Amino acid sequence: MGLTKADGGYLVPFQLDPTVIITSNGSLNDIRRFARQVVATGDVWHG
């Protein structure tokens, strides 16, 4: 018995963790934290 696949390793169940780890560089911005955010209803907003 051992951890080698030919000596009893075939009984070891596979382990996978389904949380994806994002690797993209992306882009950061903080304008939404200082800017006014209105809500619209049609296609153009008038003030």
Partner: protein, 49 residues
């Protein structure tokens, strides 16, 4: 314990009989042993199901 039968004879008148002593025997059967062994490792014992 084992043994055998007794040999008889057809004898005449005023004739001696023959000594007929059956010999015995003692069969004996010894008791023997068999074995087998399977070592394992701790990790293997903890991972394999």
């Amino acid at each position: 314990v084992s043994s055998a039968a007794v040999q008889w004879s057809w004898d005449a008148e005023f004739e001696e009989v023959s000594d007929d002593s059956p010999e015995f025997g003692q069969p004996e059967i010894p008791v023997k042993k068999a074995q087998g062994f399977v070592p394992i490792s701790i990790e293997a014992l903890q991972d394999e199901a």
